[PDB]
């Protein structure tokens, strides 16, 4: 049973590690949307102030 037990551990720790990468990329990509969402706010002011 040590082989089957240790076998799943390799895929277990590997699967959990993959979740972190996919989650970090999601948070990393989310940071881009957070920044871009901020530039749009300041960007609209450049158009509003230009219209005023």
């Amino acid at each position: 049973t040590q082989g089957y037990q240790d076998g799943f551990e390799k895929q277990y720790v590997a699967y959990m590690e993959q979740n972190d990468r996919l989650h970090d990329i999601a948070v990393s990509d989310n940071n881009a949307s957070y920044s871009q969402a901020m530039w749009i706010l300041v960007g609209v002011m450049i158009v509003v102030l230009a219209v005023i």
Binding site: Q2, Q5, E9, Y12, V13, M16
Partner: protein, 52 residues
């Protein structure tokens, strides 16, 4: 905490099987990995808990 708690289970589970291996030497039932090898795995698993 996942790998940490899992590391403790692998250590505890290894120590449980380690004691069973010692009983085989007293009663002489089959053969396999010595007790020194099983205890070494528990040590690596124990240190793995501290890292996680």
């Amino acid at each position: 905490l996942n790998g940490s708690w899992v590391a403790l289970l692998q250590t505890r589970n290894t120590l449980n099987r380690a004691g069973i291996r010692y009983m085989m030497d007293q009663n002489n039932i089959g053969s396999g990995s010595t007790v020194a090898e099983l205890m070494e795995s528990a040590s690596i698993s124990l240190k793995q808990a501290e890292k996680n």
